[PDB]
Nucleic acid binder design. Sequence first.
RNA 1: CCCCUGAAAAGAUAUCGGGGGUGCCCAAAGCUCGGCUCAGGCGGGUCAGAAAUCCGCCGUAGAGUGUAAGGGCAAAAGCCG
Lengths: 98, 169, 200, 178
Amino acid sequence: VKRTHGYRYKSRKLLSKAPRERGMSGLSRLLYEYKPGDKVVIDIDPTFISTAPHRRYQGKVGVVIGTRGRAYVIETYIGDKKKIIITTPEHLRPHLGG
Amino acid sequence: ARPARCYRRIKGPPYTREEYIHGAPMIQIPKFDMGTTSAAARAAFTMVAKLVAEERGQIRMQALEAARQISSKYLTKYVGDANYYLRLNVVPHHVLRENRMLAMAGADRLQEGMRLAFGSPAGRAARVEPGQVIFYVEFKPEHLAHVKEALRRAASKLPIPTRIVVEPK
Amino acid sequence: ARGARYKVPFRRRREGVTNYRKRRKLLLSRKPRLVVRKTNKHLIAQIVIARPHGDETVVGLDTRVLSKFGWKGDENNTSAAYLLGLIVGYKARAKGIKEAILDIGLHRPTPGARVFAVMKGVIDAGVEVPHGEEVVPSEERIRGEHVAEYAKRLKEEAPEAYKARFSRYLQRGLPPEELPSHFEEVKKKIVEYYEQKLAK
Amino acid sequence: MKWKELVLVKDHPMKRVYIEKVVVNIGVGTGGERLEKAANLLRELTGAEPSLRRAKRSIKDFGIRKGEPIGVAVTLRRDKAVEFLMRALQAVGNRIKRSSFDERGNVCFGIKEHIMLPGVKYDPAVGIWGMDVCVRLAKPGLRVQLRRRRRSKVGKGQLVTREEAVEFFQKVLGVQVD
RNA sequence: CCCCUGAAAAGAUAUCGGGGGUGCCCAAAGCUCGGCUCAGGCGGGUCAGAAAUCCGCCGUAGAGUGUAAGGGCAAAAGCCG
Ligand SMILES: [Mg+2]
Ligand SMILES: [Mg+2]
Ligand SMILES: [Mg+2]
Ligand SMILES: [Mg+2]
Ligand SMILES: [Mg+2]
Ligand SMILES: [Mg+2]
């Protein structure tokens, strides 16, 4: 039977947490202020799944283009196609590697 | 039952989650530990013999049962139930399947050939690795010849080559 | 505690000081917080900006600071709460803070509570704090008229109970029935001290 | 012999034992009007407004559903507790079984029908009612486990024990404990 | 169409492959605010009992969350108002 494609269709491992990470996450990711040109890493937080980007963007590095209210507009790539991810900071981490 | 060569080799993943398997057969081995099992009396025994697998493969439940019967009967007769401890060390967790046309086993089983080929349960086997202990004996050094004979008889019932290792406890 | 699968809550949660569900909603504002906390004897008012490595307190004071303006009322009543907000408000304004959001932690937002008196004092110093119009205590309570009325009734009913329940008031030389008069004196001294500072 | 002077004082001023509260309960099965009579009895017995207690689950064999009131209980404090407690002890006869004491300083005893209490009258309207009277004893510092902010555990030495509970009922309340 | 597995730690991935589910239901089972803590166990308590309401202690979730499966959730995403 063909693969089904719901928005979260092969995400058991990705959305699972170890026992020591159970419960609410810390709030420091909320407090980073990103400006255009900043580099961020998409690190999905499973306790806020409805605002999380698609599983294909986990671990990708994007560039902040701007803000939309409280979300950040991030320019990234899936293979060769440019993608625009709009997401809240709880699903973002600063990329220190350049 | 098919010849045991049909299920000897490890050809796929283990099939053991009985909550997903309809009609998984019940284990037909009544006991796994024979002789004197209480830990206090086993302290008298000072020797250990092991029937060790030489190859990887699957041992059917009925072969383990046949091996258990011949060895335990021999030890009971010649050594005495108070003078040895014999343990069948592996459990037949893996469920075997067969693709045969049958009635009273589901509608898909009525389609002939390789259409809907996933088999219905046919038995159980233990998946073993090289060096794995199949049978484990604790005995007194005076009975070494008898214990080796009992394990030689057990080996003749098993689908893979084995070897007997004798060591002190 | 018992076993490796036990998840120990956050340190501030198991101490019972931080409500992290409410704190998250405060941080989403991205505005400075007016933190107001109540102790048995004092009140604390802080203007705080949240940073990823830890909060930064722009201005923090408790009600001990009121002795620097010759306050002789109780340390943490409604009147003292208002004066604390005024001092914090002017100090916060001198540092560039124009707007703040009230943060009461685990205290209840009962109307007329002392937390909203600190807020009222902060508002009058020029720092805007959004609020509803039915929680600030009445000006009579801020002036301590509820304290003075209680003591006056106590004196004419049981003069000894007046002496015990306000022993520290008598020691300081300010009888409780004269609190509204003194509160205006202290409030004037605080306001004049900072408008002049702001002017210079 | 009032609430503030009913205190068992040991050799430390802050380790005193007093009646923290007295709770009176009546467990009626289903009815509202049946409950209403029991609710009226408690108001006139104790002088305090009783609170309706709703069923926690739906028990078919008892004919109760979750959320409907099947209970009436009132908690008594300070002076209303001491006054009613004295009456309740008399209805039993200043006798409490030793086994009725728990290890944590709670004492509960039953009243089969409320007429043995002084000051009440056999009334064919309210009927006949039973009662559960629970008394709690506490040393100072119990607020540490009950306050909203910075809640923590009370130290073991500051907790009321079974022995301190029986002594309070014998030495302070003058009750025969058996 | 949807979930887990197959699927080989980025992504994609088939078979008349395996285990299931969907063509609804709910004016609340939807929104928000506040309070509270669940399953279960123990001690005491009038009928009363394994199980009703009451007092206390323990209780990492062993409960609940309409509905498959997987994931999430404890001053809550559960329960009550
Ligand atoms: Mg496809
Ligand atoms: Mg939604
Ligand atoms: Mg294969
Ligand atoms: Mg993959
Ligand atoms: Mg749904
Ligand atoms: Mg809520």
